[PDB]
Amino acid sequence: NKMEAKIDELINNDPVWSSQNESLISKPYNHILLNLIVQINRVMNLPKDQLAIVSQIVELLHNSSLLIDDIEDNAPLRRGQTTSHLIFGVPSTINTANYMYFRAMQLVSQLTTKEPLYHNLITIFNEELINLHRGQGLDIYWRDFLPEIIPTQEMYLNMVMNKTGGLFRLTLRLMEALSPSHSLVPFINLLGIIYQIRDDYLNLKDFQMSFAEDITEGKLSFPIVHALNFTKTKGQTEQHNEILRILLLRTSDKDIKLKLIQILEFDTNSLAYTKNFINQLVNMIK
Amino acid sequence: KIDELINNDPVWSSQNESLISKPYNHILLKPGNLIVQINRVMNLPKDQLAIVSQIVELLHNSSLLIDDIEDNAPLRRGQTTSHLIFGVPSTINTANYMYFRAMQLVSQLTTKEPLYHNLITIFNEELINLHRGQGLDIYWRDFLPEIIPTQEMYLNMVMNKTGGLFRLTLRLMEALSPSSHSLVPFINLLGIIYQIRDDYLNLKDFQFAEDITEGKLSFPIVHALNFTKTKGQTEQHNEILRILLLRTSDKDIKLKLIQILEFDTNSLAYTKNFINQLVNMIKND
Ligand SMILES: CCCCCCCCC(O)(P(=O)(O)O)P(=O)(O)O
Ligand SMILES: CCCCCCCCC(O)(P(=O)(O)O)P(=O)(O)O
Ligand SMILES: [Mg+2]
Ligand SMILES: [Mg+2]
Ligand SMILES: [Mg+2]
Ligand SMILES: [Mg+2]
Ligand SMILES: [Mg+2]
Ligand SMILES: [Mg+2]
Numbered sequence: 001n002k003m004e005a006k007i008d009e010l011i012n013n014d015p016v017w018s019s020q021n022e023s024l025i026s027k028p029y030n031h032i033l034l035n036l037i038v039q040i041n042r043v044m045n046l047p048k049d050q051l052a053i054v055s056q057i058v059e060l061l062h063n064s065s066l067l068i069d070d071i072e073d074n075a076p077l078r079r080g081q082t083t084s085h086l087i088f089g090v091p092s093t094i095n096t097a098n099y100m101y102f103r104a105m106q107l108v109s110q111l112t113t114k115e116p117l118y119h120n121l122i123t124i125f126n127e128e129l130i131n132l133h134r135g136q137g138l139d140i141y142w143r144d145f146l147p148e149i150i151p152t153q154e155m156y157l158n159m160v161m162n163k164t165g166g167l168f169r170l171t172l173r174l175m176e177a178l179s180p181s182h183s184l185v186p187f188i189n190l191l192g193i194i195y196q197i198r199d200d201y202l203n204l205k206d207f208q209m210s211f212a213e214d215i216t217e218g219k220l221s222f223p224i225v226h227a228l229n230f231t232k233t234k235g236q237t238e239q240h241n242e243i244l245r246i247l248l249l250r251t252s253d254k255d256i257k258l259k260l261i262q263i264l265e266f267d268t269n270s271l272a273y274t275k276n277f278i279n280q281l282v283n284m285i286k
Numbered sequence: 287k288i289d290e291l292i293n294n295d296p297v298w299s300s301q302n303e304s305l306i307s308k309p310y311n312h313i314l315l316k317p318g319n320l321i322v323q324i325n326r327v328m329n330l331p332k333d334q335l336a337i338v339s340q341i342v343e344l345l346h347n348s349s350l351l352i353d354d355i356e357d358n359a360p361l362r363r364g365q366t367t368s369h370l371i372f373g374v375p376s377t378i379n380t381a382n383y384m385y386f387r388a389m390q391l392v393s394q395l396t397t398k399e400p401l402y403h404n405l406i407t408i409f410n411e412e413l414i415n416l417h418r419g420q421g422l423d424i425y426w427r428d429f430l431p432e433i434i435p436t437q438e439m440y441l442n443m444v445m446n447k448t449g450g451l452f453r454l455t456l457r458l459m460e461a462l463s464p465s466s467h468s469l470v471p472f473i474n475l476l477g478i479i480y481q482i483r484d485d486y487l488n489l490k491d492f493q494f495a496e497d498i499t500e501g502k503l504s505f506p507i508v509h510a511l512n513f514t515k516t517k518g519q520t521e522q523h524n525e526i527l528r529i530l531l532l533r534t535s536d537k538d539i540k541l542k543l544i545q546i547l548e549f550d551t552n553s554l555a556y557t558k559n560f561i562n563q564l565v566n567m568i569k570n571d
Contacts, residue, residue, distance in 0.1 A: 025421035115399035
């Protein structure tokens, strides 16, 4: 009866969860913790306690998405430090990241009571999280099943619209919806495309000038997509195949990585094409 | 084209949708209800009942895709696990994607905003509970031997972990029911019985016992370590810890652990009996 009584207590109450338990499971997230919203707000003009919550939400989603992305990308370093999954393990990191996505979601109701507005906010959250995963899904798929699919520039841009555009739009849309009041989404869409291609570009260019981890990862980056379609079109069979073989080695060898970068530089002219593309895009936004 | 591109919703084809769905479709191939029966009392319209079932189906299967990665499991329902076929990266992303697909189905449940908020909050709260309990199960396993849970700590972990999906299904139906106590306590007790039975059987069916290989603080193991600790049985206690920490696939070593659980701590019988008393709480109500 003494036991049957503890069981009765147990099942008749909400699950027990201590502040100690919360700290233990939060380790991966606290480790990775170690200005766009402020800017955008100069136009949206949201009261400050709402702006603070939009900020917590975007911060939880961004950091959590990086913990998962680093496991998905086999990344050794993030923000200058060892990635959380190498310290705490893949199991804990995945579970904590996923836990934080749901804590982010919980914060959405601290933004308002107005049932019409609430439904819209939750839909924005749900929509863009679906987008982010669809984009991340193709990015990973192309990479891990190469050469099953060789994306074209159009396929890559559409992937970036889902992947990169997801948190940019989530941030912008939440803020527009909370604003006492045309949409800046097309501008944020462009801003995100620039950001991603620039990221892909400098990952190689910084290396060529002096880790180019995107090559080790085997990612179908913007310059890489140009190089593979360029080589196919121009009948450069051997170069097409060598770009593929190197990507598939998942190599950390610095000379093999530089070889691939110089093929992009001298053989396909993918680096110049990409630098030009980014310039044409910045010109458009300006 | 850049102007077209940025002025429209992101493009996503059904072909793209099929690509990303492979890891999930894979776990769907191997079959394996309580819901239909309970509706005899909740009486949800058939269309809402289908949606609740689909929500629970997406969450359950996706959660198992993740659990198998976290547990380094080579087989699920007698078949190779999705992460060994499509890779860990795609499997995690697909599973997480389906969590959000499940979230989206919550809106097709009702138009009434008072109700809608309540359903999202139920969905949110139980996915939080699910992760809290899974995070504690994973923590004890991976930080062993830092913390050895007591039976009370284990049952609290189970209420969050296993109870999460059971309560989610039940609370969604109770919120949606057009009919006039709650079945939560019962579903909570069913969850506990379910978990302890999964832990008990993993070993008795051997007596593969993958739980040993995983190093999980299962119900029987929790009894064994707190038993050996309580009765100053130092060497037996450490031996249990040594085998769990080995992460062994060795049939002989595992049988050696089960043997200790059968004959020294008598944890298998302690567990079988615990289950019976839980079943008696219901079969005596
Ligand atoms: C569904 C989760 C999506 C998270 C997206 C995180 C992208 C991270 C990178 O932008 P980074 O590793 O250079 O920070 P990516 O290069 O696309 O892996
Ligand atoms: C946050 C997701 C939690 C999902 C928990 C799934 C538990 C699955 C098991 O019940 P199984 O591997 O025996 O099917 P567990 O023994 O606890 O890993
Ligand atoms: Mg990455
Ligand atoms: Mg990535
Ligand atoms: Mg990058
Ligand atoms: Mg498992
Ligand atoms: Mg598990
Ligand atoms: Mg199990």
